[PDB]
Design an enzyme around this catalytic site. Structure first.
Site, PDB file in Angstrom:
ATOM      1  N   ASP A   1     -29.367 -25.805  30.060  1.00  0.00           N
ATOM      2  CA  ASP A   1     -28.917 -27.062  30.653  1.00  0.00           C
ATOM      3  C   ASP A   1     -29.579 -27.314  32.001  1.00  0.00           C
ATOM      4  O   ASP A   1     -29.233 -26.687  33.007  1.00  0.00           O
ATOM      5  CB  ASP A   1     -27.394 -27.038  30.825  1.00  0.00           C
ATOM      6  CG  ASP A   1     -26.858 -28.297  31.484  1.00  0.00           C
ATOM      7  OD1 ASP A   1     -27.462 -29.372  31.312  1.00  0.00           O
ATOM      8  OD2 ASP A   1     -25.822 -28.213  32.176  1.00  0.00           O
TER       9      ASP A   1
ATOM     10  N   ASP B   1     -32.275 -34.019  31.931  1.00  0.00           N
ATOM     11  CA  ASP B   1     -31.054 -33.270  31.625  1.00  0.00           C
ATOM     12  C   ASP B   1     -31.030 -32.812  30.161  1.00  0.00           C
ATOM     13  O   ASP B   1     -30.667 -33.584  29.274  1.00  0.00           O
ATOM     14  CB  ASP B   1     -29.840 -34.168  31.916  1.00  0.00           C
ATOM     15  CG  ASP B   1     -28.505 -33.431  31.814  1.00  0.00           C
ATOM     16  OD1 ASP B   1     -28.451 -32.318  31.248  1.00  0.00           O
ATOM     17  OD2 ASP B   1     -27.498 -33.980  32.302  1.00  0.00           O
TER      18      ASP B   1
HETATM   19  C1  LIG Z   1     -20.741 -30.993  38.504  1.00  0.00           C
HETATM   20  C2  LIG Z   1     -22.070 -31.073  37.679  1.00  0.00           C
HETATM   21  C3  LIG Z   1     -22.065 -29.842  36.714  1.00  0.00           C
HETATM   22  C4  LIG Z   1     -23.242 -30.894  38.686  1.00  0.00           C
HETATM   23  C5  LIG Z   1     -22.252 -32.401  36.866  1.00  0.00           C
HETATM   24  C6  LIG Z   1     -21.212 -33.354  36.673  1.00  0.00           C
HETATM   25  C7  LIG Z   1     -21.404 -34.545  35.930  1.00  0.00           C
HETATM   26  C8  LIG Z   1     -22.663 -34.817  35.348  1.00  0.00           C
HETATM   27  C9  LIG Z   1     -23.723 -33.890  35.516  1.00  0.00           C
HETATM   28  C10 LIG Z   1     -25.113 -34.137  34.888  1.00  0.00           C
HETATM   29  N1  LIG Z   1     -25.358 -33.140  33.795  1.00  0.00           N
HETATM   30  C11 LIG Z   1     -24.381 -32.942  32.688  1.00  0.00           C
HETATM   31  C12 LIG Z   1     -24.279 -34.206  31.782  1.00  0.00           C
HETATM   32  S1  LIG Z   1     -22.890 -34.014  30.663  1.00  0.00           S
HETATM   33  O1  LIG Z   1     -22.982 -35.128  29.667  1.00  0.00           O
HETATM   34  C13 LIG Z   1     -23.427 -32.532  29.827  1.00  0.00           C
HETATM   35  C14 LIG Z   1     -23.482 -31.333  30.833  1.00  0.00           C
HETATM   36  C15 LIG Z   1     -23.605 -29.957  30.080  1.00  0.00           C
HETATM   37  C16 LIG Z   1     -22.600 -29.838  28.920  1.00  0.00           C
HETATM   38  C17 LIG Z   1     -21.213 -29.630  29.148  1.00  0.00           C
HETATM   39  C18 LIG Z   1     -20.322 -29.560  28.047  1.00  0.00           C
HETATM   40  F1  LIG Z   1     -19.023 -29.371  28.258  1.00  0.00           F
HETATM   41  C19 LIG Z   1     -20.808 -29.696  26.719  1.00  0.00           C
HETATM   42  N2  LIG Z   1     -19.956 -29.644  25.669  1.00  0.00           N
HETATM   43  C20 LIG Z   1     -22.194 -29.894  26.499  1.00  0.00           C
HETATM   44  O2  LIG Z   1     -22.645 -30.028  25.186  1.00  0.00           O
HETATM   45  C21 LIG Z   1     -23.483 -31.146  24.820  1.00  0.00           C
HETATM   46  C22 LIG Z   1     -22.682 -32.183  23.986  1.00  0.00           C
HETATM   47  F2  LIG Z   1     -22.272 -31.652  22.802  1.00  0.00           F
HETATM   48  F3  LIG Z   1     -23.432 -33.292  23.764  1.00  0.00           F
HETATM   49  F4  LIG Z   1     -21.587 -32.573  24.685  1.00  0.00           F
HETATM   50  C23 LIG Z   1     -24.726 -30.535  24.126  1.00  0.00           C
HETATM   51  F5  LIG Z   1     -24.345 -29.708  23.124  1.00  0.00           F
HETATM   52  F6  LIG Z   1     -25.535 -31.510  23.639  1.00  0.00           F
HETATM   53  F7  LIG Z   1     -25.442 -29.805  25.020  1.00  0.00           F
HETATM   54  C24 LIG Z   1     -23.085 -29.961  27.599  1.00  0.00           C
HETATM   55  C25 LIG Z   1     -24.580 -31.591  31.919  1.00  0.00           C
HETATM   56  O3  LIG Z   1     -24.597 -30.564  32.929  1.00  0.00           O
HETATM   57  C26 LIG Z   1     -23.503 -32.711  36.266  1.00  0.00           C
END
Ligand SMILES: CC(C)(C)c1cccc(CN[C@H]2C[S@@](=O)C[C@@H](Cc3cc(F)c(N)c(OC(C(F)(F)F)C(F)(F)F)c3)[C@@H]2O)c1
Length: 377
Positions: free
Chosen positions: A35, A220
């Protein structure tokens, strides 16, 4: 030595890409979501309906409790747990072992995905967005500090049940064709970049380029879709609707809710436009573009009925937190996260998506004046 890391990623469509890691002594094996959108290394550390295995700290002689709690809220889903450190390895990665911060997940809500086959997450972005704060050193920072692994990695995410490569510490030239083109990392927190122009089927959207980066644009791998700020999303959808007006679609399709199907093998690809994103380049007034085919933003899903048609979901969606270049943009490109030189590189992937008369591309140089004005403040 990169051939050992080729094809070290697996996954299921829409459920991310994961790499195998081991934690603790003796080594406990877990699949970890890769990620670039976060900065915490965290693993299931307690029973959960969706986990077939988890990290057991009591069984590790190298485990150390940091005696401090932590939680991380993502766009959807969150977890909380206990901070500690332990020895970590990547079997199909560089031949090293590092002591890394690990969040042991004790509770979670909609974080784990049923059937994804991964039990943890590897946040590869910078300390600035680590929880609880930027003093918790991210895994890749630990790796680079403790070993001789160069400060960069690259991702080749391949489409169709999916696979790919994470080359840790360098670039593998057999994974892409053509030239690499580089865009500056604007700021080391997310992997933030600047989009300076957008075209759909060769037509400039003609918005203030700040709108493209409002309030930021990031790369991302933990997100599936291309996500666009409200105004840009609406302009893009209006344009994509116009180009495909030949056929009628449920408006819930454009919201990414209803899938659409065609008789297997008759998907009218040609009526869906290519999308070009122009990124800030490395020299003054210079940019380059990456071009996305509809085969990338119409993501294939299984038949909700009994038929064996080809069905797709619209994988462009609205964002309130800026542009997100997710897996569907990254797929078919080789993406180089060159942390040492504060830049991200793009090249056409060796596992590139196919169209009969069109091709995903990375092209330059282009001239673009006032690229600095595209950054949102
Ligand atoms: C506080 C912090 C961490 C800096 C933050 C807060 C809000 C937004 C962001 C930007 N990045 C985010 C965007 S969010 O949609 C997915 C997240 C990582 C993540 C957390 C989860 F729970 C799950 N299930 C996950 O699995 C996805 C999916 F199945 F599509 F949901 C799969 F499988 F496609 F990967 C993926 C990523 O990190 C960071």
């Amino acid at each position: 030595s990169f051939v050992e890391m080729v094809d070290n990623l697996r996954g299921k469509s829409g459920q991310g890409y994961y790499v195998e890691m081991t934690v603790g002594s003796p080594p406990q094996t877990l699949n970890i979501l890769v990620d670039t959108g976060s900065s915490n290394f965290a693993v299931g550390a307690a029973p959960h309906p969706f986990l077939h295995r988890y990290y057991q700290r009591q069984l590790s002689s190298t485990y150390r409790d940091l005696r401090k709690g932590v939680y991380v809220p993502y766009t959807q889903g969150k977890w909380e747990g206990e901070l500690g450190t332990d020895l970590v390895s990547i079997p199909h990665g560089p031949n090293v072992t590092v002591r890394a911060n690990i969040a042991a997940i004790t509770e979670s809500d909609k974080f784990f995905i049923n059937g994804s086959n991964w039990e943890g997450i590897l946040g590869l972005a910078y300390a600035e967005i680590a929880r609880p704060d930027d003093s918790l050193e991210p895994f890749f920072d630990s790796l680079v500090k403790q070993t001789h692994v160069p400060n960069l990695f690259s991702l080749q995410l391949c489409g169709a049940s999916v696979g790919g490569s994470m080359i840790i510490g360098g670039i593998d030239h057999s994974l892409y064709t053509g030239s690499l083109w580089y865009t500056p990392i604007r700021r080391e927190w997310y992997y933030e970049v600047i989009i300076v122009r957008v075209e759909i089927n060769g037509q400039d959207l003609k918005m203030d380029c700040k709108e493209y980066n409002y309030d930021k644009s990031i790369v991302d791998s933990g997100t599936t879709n291309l996500r666009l700020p409200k105004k840009v999303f609406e302009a893009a959808v209006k344009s994509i609707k116009a180009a495909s007006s030949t056929e009628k679609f449920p408006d819930g399709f454009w919201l990414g809710e209803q899938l659409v199907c065609w008789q297997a093998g008759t998907t009218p690809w040609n009526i869906f436009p290519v999308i070009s994103l122009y990124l800030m380049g490395e020299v003054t007034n210079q940019s380059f573009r990456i071009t996305i085919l509809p085969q990338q933003y119409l993501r294939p899903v299984e038949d909700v009925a009994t038929s064996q048609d080809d069905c797709y979901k619209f994988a462009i969606s609205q964002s309130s937190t800026g542009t997100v270049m997710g897996a569907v943009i990254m797929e078919g490109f080789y993406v180089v996260f060159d942390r040492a030189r504060k830049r991200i590189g793009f090249a056409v992937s060796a596992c590139h998506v196919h169209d009969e008369f069109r091709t995903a591309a990375v092209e330059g140089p282009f001239v673009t004046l006032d690229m600095e004005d595209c950054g949102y403040n």
